[PDB]
């Protein structure tokens, strides 16, 4: 009970529905399911075709260019939970390029654990606005929906009356349904994790989404964490072992799994049947236990791997030594950084080089946690052990307080890094200790960090004069070592009722400094009474090709008028 | 030249003593 | 200013690439 | 036969016109 | 991969015959 | 007569007026005159000081930081003509940093032949708007006037009545004078070259500016071209020889000039006493005649010369072989190109490299006329035989129809060349024949030529539909080899009553081309009747790091409405 | 857009340089 | 004595304060 069917690990079906009868009886498929590329199908090829047995899928689900199909309500009436270990560009549901697919009817779907949903190029699909993803998913901001029949606003995706919850989200009540028949089920604000029953009572604390009886671990529908023999359990009691984050197996099971590659031979650690041990650990001929020892090399294919998503990431989960090179390239739009961090470089070494190209949303590099050493035994072409280009939000590389970096060979290469100011670049040169290598134009001295004044120098206001209609500031006249390079004073002002954060001024005559009576100012007229303003001033100076004198800026301050 | 010594570097009194006669 | 959409088009292109890259070589084994 | 660079649904239709019958299996290991 | 042959280069009928079975 | 004084070749006066009595008697100074750096002077040190003898100066005149002096009307009451062979950053008159200098009174100045006038940092000078430079100079657009007492508008620089010509130039009549006494003399519109006399009759056809009697070569004031013994002459009769573009000398003169370096030893060619012979020529022990022979190396100092003006240029006048390297660097603002052309590279070879850095107004390189060969035996650092950077108007390098180029070693290096499209760059690679050398980022593939769509591809309009209020164009749907790279259609339209020369359109669906019914269009509404418009369309596509498919543009066309 | 004035300031600076470069070494000959 | 980079009229005044008397001649050849 709770799963009368079988496992039937994931296999994918092509070109006709003949192999689909291999996947009839099974209750929960381990792995993934893809149905793709069936052109010669008919709508009649699905009315005699249904699978209520399938309830939960571990990893992901994909639909791609199968003709004649218009719905999914018959094929998968009872699919409920997607866990999403192996993802698909941080998705698990791929609804894509499906000609004639006009509805889904996936009402029994309740929770998708990890991943997102991408829907594209499906010019028949409607009923899409009636789908509250936030009930089913957490990060609704990673769901991409375009090129659909809804995108030319035609479909009256309604239900006859009350039933379907009309929930305000953005402007007004959004009726929530799947078909014109099937509503979207809403559990109350207390049965949220484990799900609710029909009348709305909470399920058992080990249920998930649906339960056949309220508060019963023997009468759930889907387990929250783990399954053991009619009871969803919080953990494995001995002598049982966790396997693939959903069940408890005995020693004999995962034991005899090892004996079949004679491919993922398995071992046991931390009461969990696992593929491999991390570093410092050992096999066991007795029981395949990760016993510690003295002294993990994830040797790539061709010493090189493009990394672009979680699907790229989890191949490097738990690695310690990378015998190759890495190309980080996320044409993205969404910060993967936490999920990026959670399966990345608990490492120190890279044998080859490192390359970061054209990635958009990488604001940092701190997800590299333990990284210390770059061997660089195979360089980037042009003799580089490191690279950067076109990183529209990258500001911090690391905090160099505790983070260290050791680089053997190669050079640095920075271009078009518009929020990466040169200060941390020279700091990275310093901590790297390879400052005697970089030639001219290894650093783009015109594009790096050219969207915020950064570096060191600070303006300080000497005198402040206010009125109801007058503002006069006085500040120390800064002069760079070439006093001709000063061009003028960039002043930035606005009002601010919060504190949560344009005129120009010619420089005065330097001429001396025993008594340089040259404290510059600007009179403001555009004042409102009793009104909080926000003003800060920046130094606008001449660019020079050499190590340019960085120029100053002032603090953002706050002034309230009469 | 001039800015090579008094602007790029900083001149000394002894360097400008060459610019006395 | 609006260049994020200009990259977003390429994001769509990369997504188009990856699925075809899945479809392409499971067949040549000879 | 076209002599042209291909992507997208153009490449999809080209692949379908080449394959016709069975074309492509999915047994990398089994 | 795919765009390395049918987009970067141009595929042949014989190259895609490997993508027949 | 015509020059009763002497020559007294140019010597410059410093630190006190003691050496000024060396230059009393002389009528026309050959060379240049600089007065500079007299701090301990008094206004009384000039009332007992005058030189009416000086009339014409060959090369240039410079005034720089002399105190106590307020005028020039007594020092030089009769200076009249500046010829300007050796110039001073394309100037011959340097009025600069003169404390207490409040007027000029240079009424007897009539014509400045070659060069310009720069006035700066003279916070006492006025009477400046009353000076028509176009009477005295040709290129008035090369005269830089700033930081003066006129720049804080105070001086009433007037004359009591009529006298001084009140000439409209820009808005109204500009009274023309030097002092409150001395008007600015205007000759009529027929005596313009040689000058006029007091009543306004034309002078002789060999006079210049002033003449003591109307139409008399024996009673001029200053020669137009050449001087010979009370008569300004068009040329030297034999046995006389031209010398420094102003006189005629016998064989004995320039003969005995040679005998004094035992520094510019002289020779004779083309009836002109000259410094040296050009290539293929020989000395003569008999008469120092440039006789031709079989088989000119201007060997630099340190193999290197910054070139920035005509003063830099004329050191390389007439050279044929440059045993060094050249740095072209004109922070400019004015096209020197014709004067640049007229004394430059009638050459073929450069032993070292070539460098062009940060020059502004160099639109071309065609002033390099005969240039063929770059040896490059000493490279630019980073292994380059060539360079470019920051050339805000450089578009054409050459016409490669007849112009050739041979490069031995080194590489090319292009950055920030915003009107230099890559087509001619690859053409220069082709003609150079050194295409198998340039690495990645030897060409900045993001900044070069990024201010005008250039390269090759051309849109063509198929169908045109008009009305009094409707405009619909149809044109051939271009598709780059990646059809996904097309993003949209940039359309540029405006009205044009002359013919002397913004909306966007999504791409339609490609999907095939047996019958690609995808001719794109745009309907216009903003039409005026009977009205000539000007429309052209550009292809807005995706950038790629590789050899990008260049994209197209349309012709500028002309459409008149109903 | 208005960067020609930004170079024009440096043009003034270069002109300031050249005259000083004339003034500087006619004196050290020793 | 200042320890500072110098240009312009600052450098002019510094040169004048150093030189005082004669300071600088103009005989490169004669
Ligand atoms: C769908 O069901 C899950 C089952 O609990 C709901 O909770 C989510 O559970 C996962 C797994 O326990 C949590 O992920 C974990 O995050 C921690 C860091 O906080 C990480 O260390 C673990 O390795 C694991 O990845 C997740 O945070 C948790 N989310 C919430 C909001 O509790 C999930 O909420 C259900 N979905 C919906 C829409 O209700
Ligand atoms: C000031 O006097 C001169 C004396 O003729 C006036 O004419 C200018 O004369 C010079 C020398 O003859 C001309 O320059 C020449 O240009 C040719 C190219 O056209 C070049 O091959 C020669 O080597 C020489 O450089 C100049 O063109 C000529 N200008 C005019 C307008 O005739 C001059 O006009 C007088 N200035 C004023 C303001 O009247
Ligand atoms: C789906 O299940 C039916 C039901 O039989 C069950 O599954 C069998 C694999 C076996 O374990 C039975 O003991 C179960 O009760 C399968 O139909 C049976 O197929 C077998 C051959 O495999 C045949 O000998 C039986 O007579 C069939 N019984 C019935 C009632 O039809 C079917 O094969 C299963 N499909 C798949 C793909 O596994
Ligand atoms: C150790 O476990 C094995 C396997 O467990 C079976 O498969 C799991 C996925 C789960 O469904 C368990 O409930 C299953 O028992 C046991 O081998 C099976 O034992 C059952 C006994 O009811 C028997 O019906 C099956 O035929 C057995 N499988 C095979 C392939 O013969 C084994 O009994 C367990 N041993 C102990 C001591 O618990
Ligand atoms: C400027 O000219 C006067 C006038 O004398 C003429 O120039 C002389 C150089 C000489 O060539 C005379 O024959 C000319 O008549 C010069 O005053 C004369 O100076 C000389 C000494 O050089 C002296 O013997 C005469 O007596 C002076 N005569 C008079 C009338 O004063 C003066 O020296 C010339 N200045 C310069 C710098 O050459
Ligand atoms: C050849 O020319 C020389 C030099 O000419 C003199 O200098 C010129 C710049 C110009 O001013 C001419 O008028 C000059 O004559 C002659 O040498 C001079 O001749 C004059 C004759 O009147 C005499 O007074 C000078 O003292 C001479 N110069 C010297 C230094 O003694 C020479 O006579 C000319 N020979 C012929 C044949 O014409
Ligand atoms: C990059 O640097 C390496 C290191 O010097 C250069 O590779 C050497 O090339 C020479 C001859 O080509 C060989 O004898 C060495 O064994 C090479 N060393 C290594 C470590 O490869 C290479 O030429 C340089 N490339 C560029 C473009 O500068
Ligand atoms: C530029 O290229 C030259 C040519 O190879 C390099 O100079 C050589 O350096 C080696 C050892 O340093 C010497 O044995 C050769 O004699 C040099 N040749 C010449 C022509 O100078 C130089 O190292 C290269 N520089 C860079 C920055 O790449
Ligand atoms: C990496 O950095 C760790 C922290 O550095 C410590 O604190 C900073 C402020 C410095 O004072 C540094 O010298 C200290 O050691 C170290 O614990 C660790 O040893 C470092 N590892 C390497 C290889 O340098
Ligand atoms: C330089 O170029 C001159 C003109 O080139 C001629 O015309 C063009 C259209 C080509 O057909 C070219 O091959 C012709 O020679 C030549 O007269 C001259 O020889 C060239 N000099 C060198 C060194 O190549
Ligand atoms: C929340 C939910 O869908 N619960 C379902 C219920 O709808 C269905 O009627 C029952 C079997 O009849 O199984 C359970
Ligand atoms: C045009 C011009 O200035 N001509 C002058 C005239 O003014 C002066 O009176 C004369 C000598 O008295 O010499 C000549
Ligand atoms: C279904 O597809 C498989 C493989 O493509 C093929 O062997 C089988 O004949 C097909 N069946 C039908 C009915 O087309
Ligand atoms: C004028 O200057 C020269 C050289 O600088 C010097 O010989 C002479 O004594 C000075 N005369 C006066 C009065 O300062």
Describe this structure in words.
Chain A is 5% helix and 24% strand. Chain A has 562 residues and is mainly beta. Chain A folds into 4 domains: 13-175, Receptor L-domain (24 nucleotide stem-loop, u2 snrnp hairpin iv. U2 a', Chain A), CATH 3.80.20; 250-292, Hormone Receptor, Insulin-like Growth Factor Receptor 1, Chain A, domain 2 (Hormone Receptor, Insulin-like Growth Factor Receptor 1, Chain A domain 2, Ribbon), CATH 2.10.220; 296-452, 24 nucleotide stem-loop, u2 snrnp hairpin iv. U2 a', Chain A (Alpha-Beta Horseshoe); 457-560, Immunoglobulins (Immunoglobulin-like). In chain A, the strands form 12 sheets. A 6-stranded parallel sheet of chain A has the order 1-3-5-7-9-10, with no helix packed on it. In chain A, strands 2-4-6-8 form a 4-stranded parallel sheet, with no helix packed on it. A 4-stranded mixed sheet of chain A has the order 18-17-20-19. Chain A is globular, with a radius of gyration of 31 Å. Chain A starts with 12 loop residues before the first strand and ends with a strand. Chain B contains 2 helices and no strands. The radius of gyration of chain B is 8 Å and the shape is elongated. With 21 residues, chain B is mainly α. Chain C has 30 residues and is an all-alpha fold. Chain C is built from 1 helix and no strands. Chain C has one helix spanning 3-24. Chain D has one domain (1-30). Helices cover 40% and strands 0% of the residues of chain D. Chain D contains 1 helix and no strands. Residues 111, 113, 136-138, 193, 224 of chain F line the site of a molecule of 3 linked components (NAG-NAG-BMA). Chains B, E: Disulfide bonds join 6-11. Chains B, E: It comes from Homo sapiens (Human). Chains B, E: This is Insulin A chain.
Annotate the secondary structure layout.
The complex is a heterooctamer, with 2 copies of chain A (562 residues), 2 copies of chain B (21 residues), 2 copies of chain C (30 residues) and 2 copies of chain D (30 residues).
Chain B: H1 3-6, H2 13-17
Chain C: H1 3-24
Chain D: H1 8-19
The structure holds a molecule of 3 linked components (NAG-NAG-BMA) (2 copies), a molecule of 3 linked components (NAG-NAG-FUC) (4 copies), a molecule of 2 linked components (NAG-NAG) (2 copies), a molecule of 2 linked components (NAG-FUC) (2 copies) and 2-acetamido-2-deoxy-beta-D-glucopyranose (4 copies).
The site of a molecule of 2 linked components (NAG-NAG) has 2 residues of chain A, from loops.
PDB class: signaling protein
Keywords: signaling, signaling protein
Assembly: octameric
